[PDB]
């Protein structure tokens, strides 16, 4: 696992989206952000440097997996055309209306399953399942409804808010079919989905993440 920082913020998951088939990175200063992803991913999967709705908040505004990418209704035609040009031709890229919070705060997904905020509209849940090609469950994490902020998930493992009970960890693990643990990033932050991104072979965490936290990440995501 590696470390990165975007314009002085260690909240890597707010400014990037990483899947098993592509990576999105906020437009901005290359140093210790795009460069980190490129050093690990060069050739392997494409990296798209993008804005979303004209902003740099591109991880928090999107949700995606290796099959599909959900973006807000305010994503521009420029941005959609650029995403489509950079990403594999079989990715389904869809604008979606979702008013509870930012998209990336209300969904956490891998290539098989998504957990969502329990109050999303039924139509929203249908579009998520269709575009991402996943089974969907309404869930909370450590009593939080903004599940995308509080979990990071791949097909290999997941990391949840450090206060998640062991009973809830076991329930979520069994539902997802992957090992889970509770832990922190960025030197004790519980905003796991904000602080890191992950796919089946790479994790990128904020710069303050400590050695024990990186060790937990490497183990549960099967990165070593």
């Amino acid at each position: 696992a590696v470390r990165a920082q975007f314009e002085n913020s260690n909240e890597v998951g707010v400014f990037a989206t990483l899947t098993n088939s592509y990576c999105l990175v906020a437009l901005g200063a290359s140093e210790n952000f795009y460069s980190v992803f490129e050093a690990e991913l060069q050739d392997v999967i494409p990296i798209c440097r993008t804005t979303i709705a004209g902003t740099r908040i591109i991880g928090r505004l999107t949700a995606g997996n290796r099959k599909g990418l959900l973006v807000p209704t305010t994503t521009t035609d420029q941005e959609l055309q650029h995403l489509r040009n950079s990403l594999p031709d079989d990715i389904r890229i869809q604008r979606i209306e979702e008013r509870l919070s930012a998209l990336g705060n209300v969904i956490v997904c891998n290539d098989h399953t998504a957990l969502i905020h329990p109050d999303l509209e039924r139509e929203t849940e249908e579009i998520i399942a269709d575009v991402l090609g996943v089974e969907v469950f309404r869930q909370t994490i450590a009593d939080h409804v903004l599940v995308g902020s509080y979990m990071a998930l791949s097909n290999q493992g997941g990391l949840v808010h450090p206060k998640t009970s062991i009973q809830d960890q076991d329930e979520l693990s069994s539902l997802l079919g992957v090992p889970l643990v509770a832990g922190s990033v960025n030197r004790g932050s519980n905003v796991i989905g904000g602080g890191m991104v992950v796919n089946d072979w790479l994790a990128v965490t904020g710069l303050d993440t400590t050695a024990p936290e990186l060790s937990v990440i490497e183990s549960v995501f099967r990165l070593g």
Side-chain angles (χ1 to χ4, degrees):
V2 298
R3 298 178 174 93
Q5 185 179 85
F6 179 74
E7 310 187 341
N8 298 132
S9 177
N10 292 334
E11 297 299 280
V12 169
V14 175
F15 304 105
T17 290
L18 180 62
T19 77
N20 290 318
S21 60
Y22 56 88
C23 176
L24 316 178
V25 175
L27 275 193
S30 273
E31 80 305 355
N32 211 36
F33 207 64
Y34 171 84
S35 68
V36 175
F37 290 91
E38 181 66 310
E40 306 299 315
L41 298 172
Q42 167 151 357
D43 285 350
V44 170
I45 56 176
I47 300 170
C48 181
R49 288 172 283 210
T50 192
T51 55
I52 298 288
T55 82
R56 287 165 289 189
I57 313 308
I58 70 93
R60 168 161 289 154
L61 289 179
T62 60
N65 66 6
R66 85 173 209 279
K67 302 184 250 199
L69 177 65
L70 296 167
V71 301
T73 63
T74 48
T75 305
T76 70
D77 283 350
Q78 281 292 122
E79 286 163 347
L80 284 182
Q81 286 304 297
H82 182 244
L83 287 165
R84 281 165 185 167
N85 192 66
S86 294
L87 265 50
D89 311 312
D90 51 11
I91 309 304
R92 187 161 160 205
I93 307 177
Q94 180 63 52
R95 292 184 177 109
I96 185 175
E97 183 179 350
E98 183 280 299
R99 309 201 183 242
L100 286 183
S101 182
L103 265 168
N105 291 349
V106 299
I107 299 160
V108 60
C109 62
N110 59 26
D111 299 328
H112 305 90
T113 318
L115 306 183
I116 60 171
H117 187 309
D119 302 326
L120 295 190
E121 300 295 331
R122 289 174 56 183
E123 184 189 339
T124 309
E125 172 189 2
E126 291 176 354
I127 291 162
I128 291 165
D130 181 34
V131 171
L132 302 183
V134 296
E135 196 181 32
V136 181
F137 298 92
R138 295 166 185 271
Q139 267 297 335
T140 54
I141 303 176
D143 297 324
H144 293 282
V145 297
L146 299 179
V147 296
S149 296
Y150 290 114
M151 182 174 203
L153 178 64
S154 74
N155 301 316
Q156 307 287 96
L159 183 64
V160 295
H161 187 301
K163 296 179 200 145
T164 305
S165 73
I166 187 53
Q167 284 210 346
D168 286 1
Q169 294 169 52
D170 290 346
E171 180 100 355
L172 293 168
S173 177
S174 298
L175 192 63
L176 295 168
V178 305
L180 296 185
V181 293
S184 51
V185 298
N186 282 320
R187 203 180 288 125
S189 180
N190 61 35
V191 187
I192 309 308
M196 66 172 287
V197 297
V198 64
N199 68 11
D200 290 354
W201 72 93
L202 170 63
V204 183
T205 72
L207 190 54
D208 280 345
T209 301
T210 67
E213 287 171 333
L214 273 187
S215 187
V216 168
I217 282 161
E218 278 283 293
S219 174
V220 76
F221 290 115
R222 297 191 27 93
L223 302 174

